[PDB]
Amino acid sequence: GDTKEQRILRYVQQNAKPGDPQSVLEAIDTYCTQKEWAMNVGDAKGQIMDAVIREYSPSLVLELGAYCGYSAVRMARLLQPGARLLTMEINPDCAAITQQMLNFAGLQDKVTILNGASQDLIPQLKKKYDVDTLDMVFLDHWKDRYLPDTLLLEKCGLLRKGTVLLADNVIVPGTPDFLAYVRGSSSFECTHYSSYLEYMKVVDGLEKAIYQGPSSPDK
Ligand SMILES: Nc1ncnc2c1ncn2[C@@H]1O[C@H](CSCC[C@H](N)C(=O)O)[C@@H](O)[C@H]1O
Ligand SMILES: [Cl-]
Ligand SMILES: [K+]
Ligand SMILES: [K+]
Ligand SMILES: [K+]
User: Fold this and answer.
1) DSSP E strand stretches across 15-135
2) How many CB atoms within 10 Å of residue 57?
3) Are the C-beta atoms of 217 and 189 separated by less than 8 Å?
4) How far apart are alpha carbons 120 and 198 in whole angstroms?
5) Is 198 a catalytic residue?
6) Of 52, 64, 114, 158, whose CB is crowded by the most CB atoms within 10 A?
């Protein structure tokens, strides 16, 4: 039958207002609430995301996991003129829907969708995509890659003192090894934010982990 993704874009095109990102977000959340797709209702986590963007005003953001573009629209609508979101998405069909979603929102010029696995694209950011360091990273992809990809970002020199990591779904279904790492590491200062999931009626959360620079090269 019809995919969730094609139906979400359909609903937006039929109900939201072109070039009104807020209306696009609200349409996605309205439809996904009606369908009882708990992981696709983004307004609770979106309050936390918005606060992070408003406080830190990042010029260059990396997103891991685009899906249909909800979080890309959510962040890009608050980015300044000339700022940039790079979003990595392994599934080309999701990349395609995300592109259409951004076009409808009028935010396509602020976003570059990178089609591939985060583990393959991250090592290309420096030379192929001319990245110095990221101002913010939003982690929202496969749970078992949150910690590995954080370590990879570190190794590739893509984090600087002050880079803000914001990770979704750290409680449900959970990213406990990622949490133990950033909370235990002197290279990250961490804050936890609770975020509700409907239907399951559970308190998920997001973790903000601000990189402090690398640990001493010595013991
Ligand atoms: N290793 C990987 N690299 C890139 N994308 C990945 C990945 N593993 C999974 N994904 C993608 O991660 C996405 C998770 S859902 C993302 C939801 C989105 N951030 C929102 O808030 O609306 C899926 O679209 C999936 O295809
Ligand atoms: Cl984990
Ligand atoms: K900035
Ligand atoms: K996720
Ligand atoms: K810490």
Assistant:
1) 60-64, 84-89, 111-115
2) 13
3) no
4) 34
5) yes
6) 64
Distance CA 62, CA 203 (A): 25
Whole-angstrom distance, CA of residue 87 vs CA of residue 96:
12
CB 105 within 8 A of CB 28: no
Q: Which domains does the chain have, with CATH numbers?
A: 1-219 (3.40.50.150)
Contact 13, 173 (CB under 8 A): no
Q: How was it solved?
A: X-ray
Ligand with an atom nearest the CA of residue 56: 3
Resolution of the structure in the document, Å: 1.2
> Which element (helix H / strand E) includes 70?
helix 70-76
Angle at which helices 43-56 and 21-35 cross, to 10°: 150
Residue 47 neighbours by CB distance under 10 Å? 11
- What is the distance between the alpha carbons of residues 53 and 110, in angstroms, rounded to a whole number? 15
How far apart are the C-alpha atoms of 45 and 42, rounded to whole Å? 6
Task: Let me know: does 4 contact 67? Beta carbons within 8 Å.
Answer: no
Residue nearest to atom 8 of ligand 1 (CA): 142
Active site residue 169: yes
Is 99 in a helix, a strand, or coil?
helix
